[PDB]
């Protein structure tokens, strides 16, 4: 007789601590090294692909980002590395990164008209247009906020209180316009010393403009610093102002708050469903690991930077 | 010669990478996974249990938190997740989380009356009460700060400097009151536009009230934003203010400085002693690991998020 062991023609090679290329009978690769290369629908719900648009541009209602006036439920938001259409008028949304962090937990917005334009009898609502935010070439302005301007050479003190009667949180956005100079300030608002006093159960904000000289980004030297808040059910926001007020018109109702992320990628969209997704491309696999990109979403394999994670399920 | 090995009657078992539930001869457990379920003394000194009280409510002296006027030395602070009494009049405490971070290193405060009520000849000291901070039904206010009000249709300028003659740091607490409208201020503080300037060797503040309309919390629409500082030996704090001043009365000598934590739990306290403590219960044990809770204080085992560790000290 004789005693021994099995052999075959397998060219499978394995790393070991004292030998880095060991021809084994069988081996189980535990690393997925391939992706579909195109964005897919995570569990049937298609993402919100802000094509050439940002979170700020979408939320404030950029005129060029008008494809997102109505947005169905999304599994994850997708944004490019450097969106072109983002705060068309110069400015900066305060706590932008915190707003994105909160948005990463939100799966649906139901935009509602909280302050109709008919709620401004003594101010102009149709002249708040700039060339920095054009629509179809002609001048325009953000769609979800109203730039209020003097009427009859006057700007009466705005005082409006909105009470949340819904059972859901409301993300309310406003802003303050920082004018070019004093003569521009009286040309737009007829008030040298203006303010915006916002009040809530938690928020106690006062905003004074900053009339100064700045640079020409997007052809304008005024800066609209936008602000946001989240208003709880049975909680009331109180706006008071006498100038520089970029008032709310539309506010997003947080109607479904689950899990999501703001994925950064310019990868194209394929009409395809998935279960794990990555910025480079979806992963349709069930191996323990993958080595495509650190950030993923969904029930995914774990990320390891190695190129060859193989486990010896054989001899030799 | 009959070479072999023994075998006991124990049914205990261990696990390995290729087999699990391997029956063994003798084995050593290294996970304690039991606790008394009661807050205990830590090396002889009882903790500070803030029952229905908060760190802000304790330090500011909430009228509903009266058992902490002469707190002795402790080792850790225990607080409920949502204390009932905290900032009874609505408002905020700036850098509250930093103050709690510093209290995590402080084992004893001795409150000293730094500014007696006789040091306010030209202002009211026994009228700054509210219904948001009741005591025995009648209205009251924080006892470690004094709300100052006009005496005879006048609020003279308040310029007081406190020099830290003590050999220990002093945690000095003050605040700014945010009124509702100009009428309310003129009722309370005769001066329409007011401020609070605060100066130290390493601090500079210029606080202005935010007279705005806000939601009614605890029946009150004003907001007391409290502020804190640590004053070193031979260092003096300079308070200037013509209104809206929630002045200091008691500061806090940091007599003993060591290791501590804020436990954030509401387990009932039993008269017991231990070397290690967790929020849910104490740990009297010499095991290398534990799994009761991540946050611990004292000479403790090392947390491991598991339920079964055992070393196969036996033959089989």
């Amino acid at each position: 007789i004789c005693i021994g062991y099995h052999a075959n023609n397998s060219t499978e090679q394995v790393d070991t601590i004292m030998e880095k290329n060991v021809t084994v009978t069988h081996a189980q690769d535990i690393l997925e090294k391939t992706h579909n290369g195109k964005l897919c629908d995570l569990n049937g719900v298609k993402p919100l692909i802000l094509k050439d648009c940002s979170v700020a541009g979408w939320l404030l209602g950029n005129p060029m980002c008008d494809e997102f006036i109505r947005v169905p439920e999304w599994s994850y938001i997708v944004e490019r590395d450097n969106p072109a259409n983002d705060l068309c008028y110069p400015g900066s949304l305060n706590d932008y990164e915190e707003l994105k962090h909160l948005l990463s937990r939100i799966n649906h917005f139901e935009k509602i008209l909280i302050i109709p334009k008919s709620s401004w009898p003594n101010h102009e609502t149709s002249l708040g247009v700039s060339a920095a935010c054009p629509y179809q070439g002609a001048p325009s302005f953000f769609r979800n906020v109203v730039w209020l301007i003097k009427k009859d050479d006057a700007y009466p003190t705005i005082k409006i209180s909105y009470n949340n009667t819904n059972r859901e949180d409301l993300l309310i956005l406003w802003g303050i316009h920082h004018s070019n100079n004093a003569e521009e300030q009286t040309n737009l608002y007829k008030n040298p010393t203006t303010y915006i006093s916002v009040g809530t159960s938690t928020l106690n904000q006062r905003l004074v403009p900053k009339i100064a000289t700045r640079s020409q980004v997007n052809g304008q030297r005024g800066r609209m610093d936008f602000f946001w808040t989240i208003l709880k059910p049975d909680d009331a926001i109180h706006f008071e102002s006498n100038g520089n007020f970029i008032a709310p018109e539309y506010a997003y109702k947080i109607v479904k708050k689950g899990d999501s992320t703001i994925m950064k990628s310019g990868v194209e969209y394929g009409h395809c469903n998935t279960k794990c997704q990555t910025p480079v491309g979806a992963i349709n696999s069930s191996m323990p690991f993958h080595n495509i990109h650190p950030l993923t979403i969904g029930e995914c394999p774990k990320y390891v930077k190695s190129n060859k994670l193989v486990l010896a399920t054989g001899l030799r | 010669i009959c070479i072999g090995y023994h075998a006991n009657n124990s049914t205990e078992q261990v696990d390995t990478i290729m087999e699990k539930n391997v029956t063994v001869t003798h084995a050593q457990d290294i996970l304690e996974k039991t606790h008394n379920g009661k807050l205990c003394d830590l090396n002889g000194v009882k903790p500070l249990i803030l029952k229905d009280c908060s760190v802000a409510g304790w330090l500011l002296g909430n009228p509903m938190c009266d058992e902490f006027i002469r707190v002795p030395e402790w080792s850790y602070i225990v607080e409920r997740d949502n204390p009932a009494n905290d900032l009874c009049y609505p408002g905020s405490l700036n850098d509250y989380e930093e103050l709690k971070h510093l209290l995590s290193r402080i084992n004893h405060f001795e409150k000293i009356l730094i500014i007696p009520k006789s040091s306010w000849p030209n202002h009211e000291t026994s009228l700054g009460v509210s219904a948001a901070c009741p005591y025995q039904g009648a209205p009251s206010f924080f006892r470690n700060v004094v709300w100052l009000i006009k005496k005879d249709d006048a609020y003279p300028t308040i310029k007081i400097s406190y020099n830290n003659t003590n050999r220990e740091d002093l945690l000095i607490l003050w605040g700014i009151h945010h009124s509702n409208n100009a009428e309310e201020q003129t009722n309370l503080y005769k001066n329409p536009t007011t401020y609070i300037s605060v100066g130290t060797s390493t601090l500079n503040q210029r606080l202005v009230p935010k007279i705005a309309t806000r939601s009614q919390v605890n029946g009150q629409r004003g907001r007391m934003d409290f502020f804190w500082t640590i004053l070193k030996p031979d260092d003096a704090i300079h308070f200037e203010s013509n209104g809206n001043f929630i002045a200091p009365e008691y500061a806090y000598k940091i007599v003993k400085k060591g290791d501590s934590t804020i436990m954030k739990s509401g387990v009932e306290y039993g008269h017991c002693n231990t070397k290690c403590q967790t929020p849910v219960g104490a740990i009297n044990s010499s095991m290398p690991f534990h799994n009761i809770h991540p946050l611990t204080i004292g000479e403790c085992p090392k947390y491991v998020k598991s339920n079964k560790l055992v070393l196969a000290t036996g033959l089989r």
Partner: antibody
Amino acid sequence: QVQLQESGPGLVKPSETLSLTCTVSGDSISSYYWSWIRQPPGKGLEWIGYVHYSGNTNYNPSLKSRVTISVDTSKNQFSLKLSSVTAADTAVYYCARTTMSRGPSLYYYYGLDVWGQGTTVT
Amino acid sequence: DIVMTQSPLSLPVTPGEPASISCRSSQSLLHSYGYIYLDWYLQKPGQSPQLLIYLGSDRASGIPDRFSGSGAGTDFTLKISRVEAEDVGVYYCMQALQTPITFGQGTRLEI
């Protein structure tokens, strides 16, 4: 530039129903509560009712039994229907825009800013 | 609320002199969101009533700067600093806190 104008007769019998109509031009009946007003010769202003643009109506408790207010957004008009005209109901009837819109959620207030030219009734 | 008592019934004052109309209430005129909810109106001899001031002291759109309100709670006062001609007319105080809106009694403000 919203302008309100009254319409209706002057002479009224002391037993039958009165009918006035107030027409608004420059903007539709869109977003505000619209209130009818009456002032006798001298004396002081008093208000009969006000109708929300939706249709919700609140009437004076003194005049609650006989009043009925309506609205017609298509025609940009709203009417008053005082029934059982007593000799007390001889006055000059004005027409104002309350401009409050104090609904369940949105609150603001601008007063009876725009007033129509009143119409006499006897 | 239901009763608005306007203290002068006819205020005599010459040109170039401050005037002070007053209007008490039988209830605290304070909305739940800290708004006074008083309105001062002027009725000229020919023209319909005109809004002068709303929400305590907030001037209306096309009104001169001489008019200014004051007061909180129940005691309220209109002030006419310049009292120039064409101010002749009956002044009213209205409460909009509750559904029974109530105007005050007139004050003629004789020139």
